[PDB]
Design a protein around this nucleic acid. Structure first.
Lengths: 50, 77, 46, 102, 35
RNA sequence: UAAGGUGAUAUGAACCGUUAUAACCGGCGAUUUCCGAAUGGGGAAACCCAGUGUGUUUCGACACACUAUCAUUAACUGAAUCCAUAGGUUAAUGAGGCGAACCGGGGGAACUGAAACAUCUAAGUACCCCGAGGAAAAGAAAUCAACCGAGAUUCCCCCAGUAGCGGCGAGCGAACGGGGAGCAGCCCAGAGCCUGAAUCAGUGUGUGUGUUAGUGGAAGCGUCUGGAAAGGCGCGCGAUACAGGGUGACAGCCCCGUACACAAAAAUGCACAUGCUGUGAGCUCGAUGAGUAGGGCGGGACACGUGGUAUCCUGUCUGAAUAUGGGGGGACCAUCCUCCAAGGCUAAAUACUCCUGACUGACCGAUAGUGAACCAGUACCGUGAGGGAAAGGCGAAAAGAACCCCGGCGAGGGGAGUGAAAAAGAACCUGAAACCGUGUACGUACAAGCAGUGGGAGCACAGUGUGACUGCGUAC
């Protein structure tokens, strides 16, 4: 837990943590999500949802 | 083989232990004798290699009762 | 001079033959060990 | 379910005949396909005393890979892929990109 | 034309390595007097 | 399910099929020589010889069937012997054999350790045998605990390398208690009322679900290099599919697939629904497993080597009490706690993998990884048990070299040709080193020794090579 608290602290330092309020996609289609991050300007990303 | 026909006493094995406790293998053979028992039901004599413990089972339980426990077991007499 | 191997098929088949091996318990264990190995020829027979 | 069959005018997509069109002669077993007048080789055929004793440098056609050919559409003018639909209870080869039956 | 036969070794030594090495039976050197 | 096939080395030859039985794949069925448990007797496995039925017969015979032993049971007829047994025959059943490990039981080492060695250890191991199952065994308290309680067995983590045992040496090594996995209890020793009363089995339709063939799958083109594009540069599209593989180099979009959505004549696994059959409930009462427990002797098992030593097993000799009675609580006794031996069954958690399916790997990459990447338990070796190899790679595709020469109608070679490549030519990717040559430069035929090293001319090249003469110098 000290490691994960130290990685998440560093992800806001090198601005690689972006918090969204909702990330969802209507149809279960890869084409829409492929669009999902172009406007978000993402190519190599990890989505973490609750 | 040295088996009682009533009690089923095999030879068992164990040790000889000397006064210097040297273990060496031996066998405790049962006290077997062939003895002819008179049955008044069958009007005959019937011989059985029986142990001396088995001779005490026979007169305590009966010779008809012992043989009934052999035909229902699978021994031949 | 006279060497140790003097062949006779009759003395061969009575010593190491299939029926000689199948006669005893310890020869059927020989034939079990030679099927378990995968041997081409099981005995001396053919 | 083969996508490339006995008499189909096909086009070659790969390998020294890229662009050339011919007809399949026989589909072999191992994914190799003889196409008419396409994959020509030069066989130094040795004359044996019988059995075509003409022993020249025979020019036959070699087998090409079945994935290196595609069926020529000719109603679009291009190479085209194959699909399988069921029309009238029969499995039907049909072209891609216009969906029409072969 | 069925060529390039091998070097079939003797059927005595099962370790072809020493097949051409020593006979591996008796080593008789007899003159040793040390006292 | 199909437009191609007739397995492989392996070309043919003669054919079969083309959308409806050519082949292929599956389910079921038929056939299934001979040997081998081998079973009709024998035998040197793969052979020899029958017996008795039953046919059919050209009269020479020919087929098919039966004929093992054992166990259990039944039928008949049957000695000494009168009854009667033993025996004998004929049936029906069932068994045997093989199998990698796991499992239970019966037997049971030694090397080794102890720094020698005998008690002890190794170790109840290796092995041998017997038997079984998909698991087995154990299992429903004669159990523990400690005055509170727990509540069948099995397995795992602690307890704890503790308590102990021990030539108190080497070493051996628990329980109680606690956390978990999984958790079912039931029968007979017995007669009644009730009276298929749930059960637990087998068999059969029925449903749900797998397994055994399968089906559909989604999208890319120009261009430069190149022998060939899957690469580069350009510009698109699929994605619940960018797992993987193949294709002339590295492919999401060429192929096979994959994600996904589907499918079963027939035969089977599993559940369920069960109908029909077998066991057999519930209630009243009684009953409560004797040559046993215990003991003497000798052994063995318990961590526990007889020690003060419980407990268990039993070879031998004895021998109770029968619930108001009996066992245990680590010698023994008294209390008072707890249980009811001498009958039996019992799922899961557990162990294993000969074998099948996928799937994975900071696993191997041909002296490695299986002994075996390859016609490998083979060649070979041994009388035998047994031992036991070495041996992968042309190319993208045989296009595997027509033809011409030398030669012995050779072998090998030189062309010509194929091909990107033949210095890829089959003794074939790459082709190292040892080792063996040829050509060239220099040195060398009066010079003694670890052969180098320091100095060093001359010469030959375009700094390199060689190294005369010379100092020092006895490898690892």
């Amino acid at each position: 837990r000290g490691a994960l608290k130290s990685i998440l602290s560093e992800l806001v330092r090198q601005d690689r943590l972006i918090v969204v309020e909702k990330f969802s996609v209507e149809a279960p289609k890869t084409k829409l999500l492929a669009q999902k991050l172009k406007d978000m300007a993402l190519e190599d990303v990890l989505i973490i949802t609750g | 083989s040295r088996v009682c026909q009533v009690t089923g006493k095999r030879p068992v094995t164990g040790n000889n232990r000397s006064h210097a406790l040297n273990a060496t293998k031996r066998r405790f053979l049962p006290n077997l004798h062939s003895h002819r028992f008179w049955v008044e039901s069958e009007k005959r004599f019937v011989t059985l290699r029986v142990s001396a413990k088995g001779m005490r089972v026979i007169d305590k339980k009966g010779i008809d009762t012992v043989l009934a426990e052999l035909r229902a077991r699978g021994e031949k007499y | 001079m006279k060497r140790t191997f003097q062949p006779s098929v009759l003395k061969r088949n009575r010593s190491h033959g299939f029926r000689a091996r199948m006669a005893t318990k310890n020869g059927r264990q020989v034939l079990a060990r030679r099927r378990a190995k995968g041997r081409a020829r099981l005995t001396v027979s053919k | 379910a083969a996508k490339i069959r006995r008499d189909d005018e096909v086009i070659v997509l790969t390998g020294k005949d890229k662009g050339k069109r011919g007809k399949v002669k026989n589909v072999l077993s191992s994914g190799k396909v003889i196409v008419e007048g396409i994959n020509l080789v030069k066989k130094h055929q040795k004359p044996v005393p019988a059995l075509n004793q003409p022993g020249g440098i025979v020019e036959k056609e070699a087998a090409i890979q079945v994935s290196n050919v595609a069926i020529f559409n000719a109603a679009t003018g291009k190479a085209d892929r194959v699909g399988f639909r069921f029309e009238d209870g029969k499995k039907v080869r049909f072209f891609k990109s216009n969906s029409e039956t072969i | 034309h069925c060529y390039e036969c091998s070097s079939d070794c003797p059927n005595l030594q099962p370790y072809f390595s020493r097949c051409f090495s020593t006979p591996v039976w008796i080593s008789q050197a007899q003159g040793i007097r040390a006292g």
